[PDB]
Amino acid sequence: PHKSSLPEGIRPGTVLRIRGLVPPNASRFHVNLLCGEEQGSDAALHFNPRLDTSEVVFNSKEQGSWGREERGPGVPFQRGQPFEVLIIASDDGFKAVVGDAQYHHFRHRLPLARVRLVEVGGDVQLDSVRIF
Numbered sequence: 001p002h003k004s005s006l007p008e009g010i011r012p013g014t015v016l017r018i019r020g021l022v023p024p025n026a027s028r029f030h031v032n033l034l035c036g037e038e039q040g041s042d043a044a045l046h047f048n049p050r051l052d053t054s055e056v057v058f059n060s061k062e063q064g065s066w067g068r069e070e071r072g073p074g075v076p077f078q079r080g081q082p083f084e085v086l087i088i089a090s091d092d093g094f095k096a097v098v099g100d101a102q103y104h105h106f107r108h109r110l111p112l113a114r115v116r117l118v119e120v121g122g123d124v125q126l127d128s129v130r131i132f
Contacts, residue, residue, distance in 0.1 A: 001119060001120070001121045002119070002120045002121070002126050002129065003117060003118070003119050004117070004118040004119075004129055004131060005037065005116070005117055006115065006116055006117055006118065006131070007037075007116055009113055009114075009115060009116060010089060010112065010115050010131075011089070011112070011113075012089055012090050012091050012112065013089065013090075014088075014089040014131065014132070015086055015087070015088050015089075015131070015132040016031075016085075016086065016087040016088075016118060016129070016130070016131055016132075017084070017085070017086055017128075017129075017130045017131075017132065018031060018084070018085040018086075018087070018120065018126070018128075018129050019082075019083075019084050019085075019126075019127045019128045019129075020082065020083060020124055020125050020126045020127045020128070021080075021081065021082045021083065021124075021125040021127065022049075022051060022077050022078060022079050022080065022081060022083065022123070022124060022125075023079070023080070023123055023124070023125055024079050024080040025079065025123075026051045026052075026079055026122075026123035026124070027050070027051060027052040027122075027123050028048060028049065028050040028051060028052055028053075028122050028123060029048075029049060029120070029121065029122030029123050029124035030046060030047060030048040030049075030120070030121055030122050031045075031046075031047040031085070031087065031118070031119075031120050032045065032046050032047075032117075032118070032119045032120075032121070033045040033087075033094075033115045033117075033118060034115070034116065034117040034118075034119055035110065035114040035115060035116055035117075036116050036117065037116065037117060040064060041116075041117070042060075042061055042062050042063070042110060042114065043059075043060055043061035044060060044108070044109070044110040044111075044112065044114060044115050045058070045060065045087070045094050045106060046058065046059045046060065046061060046066075047085075047087065047096060047106075049075065049077045050075075051075070051077065051078075051079055051123075054074075054075050055071055055072075055075060056071065056072040056074075056075055056076075056077075056103070056104075057069050057070070057071055058070040058071070058072070058096075058104060058106045060109040060110060062109075062110065067109060070104070070106060072096070072103050072104040073103070073104075076098040076099060076101075076103060077098070082127075083098065083099065084098070084099060085097065085098055089112055091112075092107055092108065093105055093106050093107040093108050094106045094108075118131070
């Protein structure tokens with residue numbers, strides 16, 4: 001579980017660039033924007049590519065409960081292939097970019113100002129996480 005602590009927060013114009021590879025027998029992996037360091041902290045954003053079920057799920061988590069799922073179009077990821085993801089924060093939500101194209105827009109459910117941590121986990125080879 002790869003963590004990038006952001007205890008002073010993030011603001012609109014923050015761009016997360018994630019570079020890595022999906023391993024050849026991957027089931028699923030995720031990128032979480034969390035609101036604290038404690039176990040079970042709220043997730044302003046949960047970005048969850050699922051190779052095992054061929055979908056990409058977006059959701060939030062508040063007081064331990066998952067919200068309503070949104071899905072992107074198809075699955076722009078492949079077992080055994082490298083990827084590049086941007087997650088962009090704006091005033092109204094998060095924009096996900098995969099490879100050469102924008103993939104999905106996720107409107108804020110929690111205030112952006114609550115985000116304090118980026119966490120990447122699951123079946124993923126993480127080569128770099130940059131936060132511009």
